[PDB]
Write a protein that binds this ligand. Structure first.
Ligand SMILES: [Ca+2]
Ligand SMILES: [Ca+2]
Ligand SMILES: [Ca+2]
Lengths: 118, 69, 158
């Protein structure tokens, strides 16, 4: 045997339907906020290149500088990628442990059955 | 040691082999290219850097959930 | 607690509530107390090609039984039809919104965060609104809505 509730159940839905509407929306903002942190952060590491003024020994030594960096960075990127990978495992691993701890009827078919032709 | 000379030399070689024949105008062309790829990478890193962060968080809420059940 | 169906029930037209009455007043013929016990749900299932065991049946009922009667009354039957109404958030998605609530990244949505979030919406959040949601959410009552509760809590929410 059990009892009744405090506020209109239809309302509770509308808030729930709204807490999400916002969060979903507040996510889009955290997202548009990232795309912006990407540009500004790339403008710091990946400074813009102004060749217009460089000479030959200037242009070459830089081409050498760059060629040299490409490898250093592709490695940094591997290490993180490395870890983000270990995590997919990790996350999918714990996701498993939790998982381990944790007929058919339509409405109209029934109504059809009870009332007849309605 | 000797094995270490090779890495140093063959490293320099790679630089020579790609840039040395390039001309004033072809370098600008190369520097652009090279920079462009350096950037592309630094960006691939970012999204990952971000990925890794949300991951720190995804996991944590997992350890939370677990201890609780 | 609460539900996406309960609201659906309050949502049925006065014309709707009626046909279910009929459907219900028939579904009960030959029933002593005037409620749907297995013997009755059995009768109809059988018209639908099914023939569940008492157990499979009693279980079909407990999912709707709210007064431990062990049988389905109109209101309950009322809910039962809403449930069986029709089918139309993914875990992955909610996992992301829950994150948007948890502002202190402790992996738990607490009163403060709930309220903060609760205020984000245009609607005039009353003192009752708050106490109630936090009430359906915290099915364990530990002060904070945990990921799993946040799941069952937002369950079905369009
Ligand atoms: Ca009952
Ligand atoms: Ca929190
Ligand atoms: Ca809780």
């Amino acid at each position: 045997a059990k009892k009744k509730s405090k506020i209109s159940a239809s309302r509770k839905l509308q808030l729930k339907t709204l807490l999400l509407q916002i969060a979903k929306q507040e996510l889009e903002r955290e997202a548009e906020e990232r795309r912006g942190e990407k540009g500004r952060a790339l403008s710091t590491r990946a400074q813009p290149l102004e060749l217009a003024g460089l000479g030959f020994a200037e242009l070459q030594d830089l081409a050498r500088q760059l060629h040299a960096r490409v490898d250093k960075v592709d490695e940094e990127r591997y290490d993180i990628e490395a870890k983000v990978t270990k995590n997919i495992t990790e996350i999918a691993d714990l996701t498993q442990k939790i998982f381990d701890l944790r007929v058919r009827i339509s409405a109209d078919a029934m109504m059809q059955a009870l009332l007849g032709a309605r | 040691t000797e094995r270490e000379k090779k890495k140093k030399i063959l490293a320099e070689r790679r630089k020579v082999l790609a840039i040395d024949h390039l001309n004033e105008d072809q370098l600008r062309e190369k520097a652009k290219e090279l920079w462009q790829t350096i950037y592309n990478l630094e960006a691939e890193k970012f999204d990952l850097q971000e990925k890794f962060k949300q991951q720190k968080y995804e996991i944590n809420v997992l350890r939370n959930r677990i201890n609780d059940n | 607690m609460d539900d996406i169906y309960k609201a659906a029930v309050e949502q049925l037209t006065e014309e709707q509530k009626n046909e279910f009455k009929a459907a219900f007043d028939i579904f009960v013929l030959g029933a002593e107390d005037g409620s749907i016990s297995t013997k009755e749900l059995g009768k109809v299932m059988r018209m639908l090609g099914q023939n569940p065991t008492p157990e499979e049946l009693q279980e079909m009922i407990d999912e709707v039984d709210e007064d431990g009667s062990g049988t389905v009354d109109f209101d309950e039957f009322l809910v039962m039809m809403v449930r069986s109404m029709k089918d139309d958030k993914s875990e992955e998605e909610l996992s992301d919104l829950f994150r948007m609530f948890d502002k202190n990244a402790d992996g738990y949505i607490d009163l403060e965060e709930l309220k903060i979030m609760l205020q984000a919406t245009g609607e005039t959040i009353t003192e009752d609104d708050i106490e109630e949601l936090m009430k359906d959410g915290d099915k364990n009552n530990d002060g904070r809505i945990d990921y799993d509760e946040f799941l069952e809590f937002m369950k079905g929410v369009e």
